[PDB]
């Protein structure tokens, strides 16, 4: 479930990560 972070319309967002690695 848990959860979250809504990217609303026309709002930029930046991740990469992924804190556990690739």
């Amino acid at each position, epitope marked *: 479930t848990r959860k979250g*972070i809504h990217i609303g319309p026309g709002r930029a967002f930046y*991740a*990469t990560g992924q804190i556990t690695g690739d």
Partner: antibody
Amino acid sequence: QVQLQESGPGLVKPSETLSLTCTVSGGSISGFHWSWIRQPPGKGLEYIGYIYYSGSTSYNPSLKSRVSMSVDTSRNQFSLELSSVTAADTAVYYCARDFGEYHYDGRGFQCEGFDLWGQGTLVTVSS
Amino acid sequence: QSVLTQPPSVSAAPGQKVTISCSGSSSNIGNNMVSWYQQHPGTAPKLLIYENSKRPSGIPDRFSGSRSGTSATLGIIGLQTGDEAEYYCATWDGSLRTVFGGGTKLTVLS
């Protein structure tokens, strides 16, 4: 303000690859996920997939084996590749900017979205 | 039948309340936020509602949506002529895609 524009062939022979490019202006590709969504005439809308500005993708599971998307930061363009097309791929094809829920889980971007659309381009599949 | 279900058709008299219903399941609406689209034929789809009930600016109140349970509903008050179009709902579905309802044709009773 920010405007997207579909481009590519209008007629395509079955079994060949369909290609299209969405061209964006007034804003950067950066920081957004972007999508192609098609519409067979008189039918409703089917989402094909999305691509993240940095290049990561996610393709509708029904088309995944046939579909391919790519993003070109420099040209400010992104693009679609439908393979081995048939009668069923005849549609108006729209490109779009997305929005939705993000998860740090591993499920990443959940697309609920599309606030920005091109005008769409009709593509006819025929021999 | 589709993952999301809408009524193929809905009608009301210029000036009347109407309501379009999007119907789904735990797999989708129980877990993601729906959005709403007006489509006039020959033009692209245009975003009416997002996040169940938020309204992008430029959209008239009188356009309102909401979610309850695994269902969602678009409501159009004070009907007009330019309101005649096809309306879609959409969300993420557990099947791993954005999904649209079949599309409700709203006819304003001339």
